[PDB]
């Protein structure tokens, strides 16, 4: 019908959603968990340091074996680092030097990279010839790539700057499913432990939950007020925390569809670049534009500890599957492993 | 000690050596960036300096390898990837001279130049300014006064004064005159006139960087 009538209907639906959310909230998380004993001060030291790159590191992902991690930098080289022995397992020479995302397959056979170029290239690490090769090149996106993360050895969800997410098939190299619910360009991606639903954060200050099989936005969250650069999924799978550029990190949940609490401090004025969760979920390690990294108490919103080992913008932060150590990457060409 | 990890360490050392060689090769090679208004003449300067996403063109001139990047096919948020180009040797900004009455286009070009020159990620990089369609501007200036675009231009309607005023207005947008350069050049149809200016600006920036590293400046 008319545009005005549809806009009025959408406004009425948004008002109804807000009323339902408000009437379904009775007690805040902070007042529920105030009775919990405080975590206390946390001290972490740089157990390992990596200095093989020669440019700005933009991404880093942890393998499922908790031993190897892949790092991406603007020099055009992807390095598979050995965490225990501080060794370079492989060096991947990129055809395009512009890379801002990388991923490691759960089986460890494949890795993915992407950046300004609209291709999320897949490299095979188990070739018979002994050298890495470009297994597939996904060239269906029209904007800059932000994050493509593996689901299996044949499927991968890619988020690009054209405000659309895609579900690529490695064997056929085609978009099985395309998600077009976002209005702003998607920046970060995260996957649930059961690998059935995923939530993505865009620059429109909104995060949307998607279904891998069906392919529509089940829920959307508009608790922020600026661009969203980081997002992570709780190990339980019923909640997720995302960063933003207004020095605020908010923890949303899926079964209530509202913001449980927010993490912020008056001293902190810079945005959040990377967000990761520990195995327990008690500690929320969030990156920031300044040289240091902060560890937040998830259930109390308290500054548990500060990781200030870097001297430039922190870009990528990750926590291994077993939670033994935390790796922090920055633009100073240095990768540090904390524990 | 180690039993089989010695070969792994040797492989890591070989990878480190290869990475150092590649990094030295990349640092020896100059890096350039292209930006400007729509249809400003980028497709013309690309043909002048003879060789989807980012388009990369590589060419060697005077024993100096050039890397040139064109970003005109990305209809996304610029500030989400403008920091990815931090550290480029120079930025080539192209504005068509015969665009002062094309509606406002010159105002948009000035806005883009002000946004890119005052950006916090390019506070030290040099800017190479190219003015294309000079012949069209000379033909149009006779019939159309420059006061249409700039109402405060109290001058003659000849090519020299108009070009000087345009150059002065474009250079006045820079509020970082302390340690920044603006190499303004007028394009020519003849070859080896634009690439020569690019090489001169590049070697000037290289001299400036070497002096800064040596501590003289």
């Amino acid at each position, epitope marked *: 019908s008319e545009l005005d009538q549809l806009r009025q209907e959408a406004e009425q639906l948004k008002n109804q959603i807000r009323d339902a959310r408000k009437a379904c909230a009775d007690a805040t998380l902070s007042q529920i968990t105030n009775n919990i004993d405080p975590v206390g001060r946390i001290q972490m030291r740089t157990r390992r340091t990596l200095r093989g790159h020669l440019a700005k590191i933009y991404a880093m992902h942890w393998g499922t074996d908790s031993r190897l991690l892949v790092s991406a930098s603007q020099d055009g080289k992807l390095i598979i680092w050995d965490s225990y022995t501080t060794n370079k397992v492989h060096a991947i020479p990129l055809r395009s030097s512009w890379v801002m995302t990388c991923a490691y397959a759960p089986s460890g056979n494949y890795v993915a990279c992407g950046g300004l170029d609209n291709i999320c290239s897949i490299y095979n690490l188990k070739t018979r010839e002994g050298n890495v090769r470009v297994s597939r090149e996904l060239a269906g996106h029209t904007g800059y790539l932000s994050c493509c993360r593996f689901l299996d050895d044949n499927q991968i969800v890619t988020s690009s700057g054209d405000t659309t997410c895609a579900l690529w098939d490695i064997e056929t190299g085609q978009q099985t499913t395309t998600f077009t619910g976002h209005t702003g360009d998607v920046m970060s991606l995260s996957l649930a432990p059961d690998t059935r639903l995923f939530v993505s954060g865009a620059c429109d200050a909104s995060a949307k939950l998607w279904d891998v099989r069906e392919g529509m936005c089940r829920q959307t969250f508009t608790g922020h007020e600026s661009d969203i650069n980081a997002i992570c999924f709780f190990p339980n799978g019923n909640a997720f925390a995302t960063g933003s550029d207004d020095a605020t990190c908010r923890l949303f949940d899926l079964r209530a569809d509202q913001e449980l609490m927010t993490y912020s401090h008056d001293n902190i004025i810079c945005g959040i670049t990377s967000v990761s969760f520990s195995k327990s979920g008690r500690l929320l390690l969030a990156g920031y534009d300044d040289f240091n990294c902060n560890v937040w108490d998830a259930l109390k919103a308290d500054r548990a500890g500060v990781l200030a080992g870097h001297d430039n913008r922190v870009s990528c932060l990750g926590v291994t599957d077993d939670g033994m150590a935390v790796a922090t990457g920055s633009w100073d060409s240095f990768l540090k492993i904390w524990n | 000690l180690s039993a089989e990890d010695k070969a792994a360490v040797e*492989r890591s050392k070989m990878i480190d050596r290869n990475l150092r060689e590649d990094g030295e090769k990349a640092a020896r090679e100059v890096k350039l960036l292209l930006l400007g208004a729509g249809e400003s003449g980028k497709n013309t300067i690309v043909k002048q300096m003879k060789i989807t996403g980012i388009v990369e063109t590589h060419f060697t001139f005077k024993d100096l390898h050039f890397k040139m990047f064109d970003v005109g096919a990305q209809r996304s948020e610029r500030k989400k990837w403008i920091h990815c180009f931090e550290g480029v040797t120079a930025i080539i900004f192209c504005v068509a001279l015969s665009d002062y009455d094309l509606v406002n286009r010159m105002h948009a070009s000035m806005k883009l130049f002000d946004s890119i020159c005052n950006n916090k990620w390019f506070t030290d990089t040099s800017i190479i300014l190219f003015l294309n369609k000079k012949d069209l501007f000379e033909e149009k200036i006779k019939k159309s006064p420059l006061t249409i675009c700039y109402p405060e231009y109290a001058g003659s309607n000849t090519y020299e004064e108009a070009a000087a005023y345009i150059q002065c207005q474009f250079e006045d947008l820079n509020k970082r005159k302390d340690t920044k350069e603006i190499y303004t050049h007028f394009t020519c149809s003849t070859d080896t006139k634009n690439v020569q200016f690019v090489f001169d600006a590049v070697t000037d920036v290289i001299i400036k960087n070497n002096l800064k590293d040596c501590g003289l400046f």
Partner: single-chain antibody
Framework: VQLVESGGGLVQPGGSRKLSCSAS????????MHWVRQAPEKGLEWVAY????????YYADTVKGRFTISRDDPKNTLFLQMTSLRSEDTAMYYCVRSIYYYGSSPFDFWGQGTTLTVSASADIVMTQATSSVPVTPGESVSISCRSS???????????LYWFLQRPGQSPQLLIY???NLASGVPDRFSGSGSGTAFTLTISRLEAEDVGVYYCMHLEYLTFGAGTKLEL
């Protein structure tokens, strides 16, 4: 992945010979190489090893000084020049590729080898006993091996390898590090051990596994005596 060997033939004792290996289908520059010598009646014997960067060259106790090994990465050819040969070296040699990194499978591919005929301590010793083990198709056969020194390194990885050499065929890697199965082999093969005694088990045996099994990497690479299965 192909490894063609050349340079064999009858040679008078006390002379010199050159062995050449041609490598194709894989990145030869980033692959370490080994030379394995097998006597007409005895088992496999290690000779020499050269790394990817042509450094850290190792030789056997009875090979050091007498033999030299070099590689040509641009030519994709391995050269093994032998001088002052005697009657104890009348055996066919093998060229083995091996790349060493986390999760790698060294000694995965073995060359065809060439026959060479000559006319007239402190090292880990692998015994493995079991000279002959009669087998029946469809049954389960277990192969046991023993090592003088414990192979369980301080890093938690035990360096043990199992090789299968079918009659008139080049040896193939079955299990590396006694717990990881090599690529391209059936899953029925299994391996286990406690650092001193190692056991290789085959389930649902058929006629394609008839051959001689060899066992080995903590220090420089003695082979086992060799267990032969008779069908």
């Amino acid at each position: 992945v192909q490894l063609v060997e050349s340079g064999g033939g009858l040679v008078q004792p006390g002379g010199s010979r050159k062995l050449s290996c041609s490598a194709s289908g894989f990145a030869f520059s980033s692959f370490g190489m080994h030379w394995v010598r097998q006597a007409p009646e005895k088992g496999l014997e290690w000779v020499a090893y050269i790394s990817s960067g042509s450094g850290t060259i190792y030789y056997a106790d009875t090979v050091k000084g007498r033999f030299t090994i070099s590689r040509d990465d641009p030519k994709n050819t391995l050269f093994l020049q032998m001088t002052s040969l005697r009657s104890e070296d009348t055996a066919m040699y093998y060229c083995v590729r091996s790349i060493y990194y986390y999760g790698s499978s060294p000694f995965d591919f073995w060359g065809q080898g060439t026959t060479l005929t000559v006319s007239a301590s402190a090292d880990i010793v692998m015994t493995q006993a079991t000279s002959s083990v009669p087998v029946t198709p469809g049954e389960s056969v277990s192969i046991s091996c023993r090592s003088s020194k414990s192979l369980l390194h301080s890093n938690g990885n035990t360096y043990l390898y199992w090789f299968l050499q079918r009659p008139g065929q080049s040896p193939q890697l079955l299990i590396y590090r006694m717990s990881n199965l090599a690529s391209g082999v059936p899953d029925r093969f299994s391996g286990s051990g406690s650092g001193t005694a190692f056991t290789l088990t085959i389930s649902r045996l058929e006629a394609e596994d008839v051959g001689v099994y060899y066992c080995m990497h903590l220090e420089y690479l003695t082979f086992g005596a060799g267990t032969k299965l008779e069908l």
